[PDB]
Subunit: 449 residues, 3 copies
């Protein structure tokens, strides 16, 4: 809708509100097939140049099949990482079924007459099939009358050119699979062309507005998809495409921006610092909040946030209280402490946080007008209305030029409520109460003395 | 062999045993050559369409050579990172030799009659050579009678098509090298086709079962290899392929899984936490243990672990005592402390650790039966026998479906042996004794008072 | 010039001096155009094989245009990350202008007669234009007399082959843009060939020695560039290439190497450790020092360092005092403390730091001579003169073979100036004075008692 933003001067943080959710919760598994020819590399006596080229491209086909055969032996399972298990388990389950006797025949037969079908496998999963390239019919009808005789028939050059074209796709598929150990992501247009992907989106048992969502964001849908190599058996090459399912849609999302907040004394080493933790994306999800701590797991498209729940934490909705009253007791807001007063900026959705310390030169400029604000020591913020760049020391940053309203929530920097002599100044993952507890402990060790 | 797994309730950790080692310790360097033609871009008067296409593809060849010439000037050396020095130094050493006078002639001459050879260079390294594409013979015999006259001879269309085909590989090689600054990894099938790689594996002075190991895991062999650009000199393009050498084979490996272990009091902020560090892969290696702390440096293929020793630490074998008696004195087991009681799961090899805290909903489900276990606050574990998924808050995880035996080692959670008032609750990289030492120090500051 | 290196025994660190700077501060934006044909996929009755191939390649063209049309709707803006805002804002600004009425016509018209031009847009930016592929003229003059009639004219096979060739580039461009959501980096040779890039470098309003710098490091220039998709409107495909501008040139750069420094007592757990922080690249920049903490943001070419200022911190030049007198007061040198005495090495520019502890076996070897140094417990260093490898436990490292002079600055390891009983042994981001302050605090808690 209408993007908005709040900067909290008291904690050197900012929240961008107004975004709408799209969280991956499930997976559609589709089977993609290429019908192959069982040729025997039949050789006949021929030195005709058009015969050589047909043999040369038939060898590239033979090798492609044989490399895919040595690659399906080695169980494709290297799309797992970071303790979350395998993203691909849904599809690896389908590959296991395909290796069952008569299951390839079952797709062979549904794809006897048509390109699309809905096959139910003997494990109860109703997969969408698709034949995307027919090399069995091509090689068997155009190329065997050419090599299956005592002396070779001579082909026309259009056949030579059309075979190179048709075989190309099989080769690029093999190429990708052999440098990725059977699993790819993103899913390339060789794995699945824009037309085939859009048909597959159109053909799924899902709601029309969610078909619209995927069609309008196909690049993001690709980036969140996998292609898994299954099996080459009985004149069929089969691989599984795993497409994202968005079980959470149109819940509010917001992004937390954080920057270090220090004191501004003139003596170096007399200064204390604190910074809010768990910067990142927060989406309302099923009564709680899904939190996405890694910067890259969320792709943003206008006002929609596409995230994978696989690398997220689930928090109580009280976590939002850290943005309105960082001292409330409902939620133990987490902070980091240091004495590292080094200047820096964070480009937010509608502006920029600037943490300026020491002798660093900190400004915000307009392209035509030059400098229009100078930041003082401390943590400060500027809206993107009328600003194009911000500079901190020798680095220049470009402010985002999105339309929206910022709100500067004034407040005392909470670093000023702390006595520097009893401040726990090297805390890596503490909390507001956990710092007040060590202060109250260290106020007792000075109480007796 | 038979994968097994032990979960230690007392420390919220688990070990997967049964894997077999394959650690990269060395490098084979092979020289890959493409013989080139020194054509002068000879132009003759011709507007015949088949002449244009031959000129168009000869310009793409000329430029390819000239870009590779400007790229070999800039010393290919950007495959170094993280303080470990250069992975590629073995091959960069061979490139330096190749620039010596008469060393290209020496390979020119061994490859006068055959495609394979074993050349000894003037530095005593016995490299495997290989001519993979002959453009000198092709261009000099099919294309100069076509452009080296007053008026051009006209070529047949098969020549046009065959030249595009043969020249393609040179172009994709140039493409790769110019976006990677002379070093690539993985090694693409353009750098080295599956056939050429399998021949090169077959042709090395190594033991037959280790030839088998590499042939059966070519995708992993590629991912651990480099291609380095050397030199274009005297009608030869030469680049070096560095293949992995597995100096450690068939020693036991095991993977440590760790998850946070906290108290389960009902009051928020009254809870302490600890977590074991150095999760990852451990392989027995030459009387010690090679430890691989980064998740991605180890590719797993069935029960074999392929790791690069370049990013590993070497530990005493006593490090395994942390999995059997975390309090023993032989080895100072390392732990992290916090008050971050946030729920999470770790998908292990044969099961799942679940650290459930607060109000988080934590279950394990079977596809057909639905929920079949509910986790309580604390750290717990479930085997993959009869379970397909585990859910923690809004995230769903897929359990691995490998065959093996799990063993639930019951025990008191060691977090319960600690007095929360004297607990060092924000320790980033501590150790069991190092925490007991600060407890014993803080038991003295309360002893006088 | 002459690379040099200093190892500081007192702090287990080393500095490599002698490098020359090249820091990205700005951006050149160029507009790259491909003139397109507005064909209507005109179908006529034809089953001639050469007609099929022309239709097949015209469909691949139609789809390419239509996918690029659905991709330009979704605002290309996923080259932003890590709080630094968008690297691409300079170019996204040009895309916004191009969507203005009559701005595509303005480039259409400057490129009516020539391939190069300098167009001033209605926002005052003087961009370099370029027409790199003309498919409007090709399709309109060779292919419409072929499909714009009642029955199709038959084309020659050279036309079929030339169209495949010319259309290829458009297809690979679409391929790249659709798996990258409209932004690519590095800039591929499909986005911009070496010839086109070198012309664009030659054609910019910049100084001749800086043209030389870019021409001689084109691979690095690519790696630091972006390609952004703009707009398909009025028979023009336009995308923006953003090339690096080096606002800082030929200032001194140096790289800091750091390794843990511990005590060498024989009892495990009685040992304290400290390590200098902020290892990395330091370049003099405009009276301060630009510091590059991430290892990969700086590409090194002989003695030149190419860095992006976007991910850098700006420090006072007094930060160099940490390498000459780590205790000076001008700058609060930052250190990390632990009890993690685990052995390791750092390969420097002209040598190797070795931190050897426990029972670890630590040597430096020469290829022909074998072991030539054995390291003792502590932190030590060896020059690359006469050494080829260094081994720490089970890992082998290759020393860099660059020419230069090392200097071993002897000195007492400063870890020895600390009383282990009052040492803050788990400090994550402390400083020299900040450790002396907690020592002086903990010397008072023992003073009363
Ligand atoms: C600190 O401790 C005193 C006495 O033990 C108590 O009365 C006071 O409320 C405590 N304050 C905080 C903020 O915990
Ligand atoms: C703690 O200190 C006391 C006296 O200094 C000593 O007797 C005791 O063994 C120590 N305990 C530990 C666990 O270090
Ligand atoms: C430590 O404190 C004493 C008295 O408070 C002071 O005289 C001394 O100079 C201090 N030393 C340091 C290194 O701060």
């Amino acid at each position: 809708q209408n993007i908005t933003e709040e900067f909290y001067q008291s904690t050197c943080s900012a929240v961008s509100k107004g975004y709408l959710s799209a969280l991956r919760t499930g997976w559609y598994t589709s089977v993609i097939t290429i019908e192959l020819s069982n040729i025997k590399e039949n050789k006949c006596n021929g030195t005709d140049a058009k015969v050589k080229l047909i043999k040369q491209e038939l060898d590239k086909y033979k090798n492609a099949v044989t490399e895919l055969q040595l690659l399906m032996q080695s169980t494709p399972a290297t799309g797992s990482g970071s303790g979350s298990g395998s993203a691909i388990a849904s599809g690896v389950a389908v590959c296991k079924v395909l290796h069952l006797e008569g299951e390839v025949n079952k797709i062979k037969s549904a794809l006897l007459s048509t390109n699309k079908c809905v096959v139910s496998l003997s494990n109860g999963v109703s997969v969408l099939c698709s034949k995307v390239l027919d090399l069995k019919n091509y090689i068997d009808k155009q190329l065997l009358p050419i090599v299956n005789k005592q002396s070779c028939s001579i082909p026309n050059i259009e056949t030579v050119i059309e075979f190179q074209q048709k075989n190309n796709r099989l080769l690029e598929i093999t190429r990708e699979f052999s440098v990725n150990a059977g699993v790819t992501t993103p899913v390339s247009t060789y794995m699945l062309t824009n037309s085939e992907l859009l048909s597959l989106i159109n053909d799924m048992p899902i709601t029309n507005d969610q078909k619209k969502l995927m069609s309008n964001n196909v690049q993001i849908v690709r980036q969140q998809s996998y292609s898994i190599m299954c099996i080459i058996k009985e004149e069929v090459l089969a691989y599984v495409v795993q497409l994202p399912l968005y079980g959470v849609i149109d819940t509010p999302c917001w992004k937390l921006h954080t920057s270090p907040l220090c004191t501004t004394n003139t003596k170096e080493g007399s200064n204390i610092c604190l910074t809010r933790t768990d910067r990142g994306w927060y989406c309302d999800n099923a009564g709680s909040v899904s939190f996405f701590p890694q910067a890259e797991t969320c792709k943003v498209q206008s006002n929609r946030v596409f995230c994978d729940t696989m690398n997220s934490l689930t928090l109580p909705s009280e976590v939002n209280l850290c943005n309105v009253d960082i001292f409330n007791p409902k939620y133990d807001c987490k902070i980091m402490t240091s004495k590292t007063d080094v200047s820096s900026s964070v480009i937010t959705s509608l502006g920029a946080i600037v943490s300026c310390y020491g002798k660093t030169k900190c400004t915000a400029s307009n392209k035509n007008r030059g400098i229009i604000k100078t930041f003082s020591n401390g943590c400060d913020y500027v809206s993107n209305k009328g600003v194009d760049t911000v500079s901190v020391g020798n680095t220049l940053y470009y402010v985002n030029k999105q339309e929206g309203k910022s709100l500067y929530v004034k407040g005392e920097p909470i670093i000023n409520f702390y006595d520097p002599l009893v401040f726990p100044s090297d805390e890596f993952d503490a909390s507001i109460s956990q710092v007040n507890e060590k202060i109250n402990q260290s106020l007792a060790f000075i109480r007796k003395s």
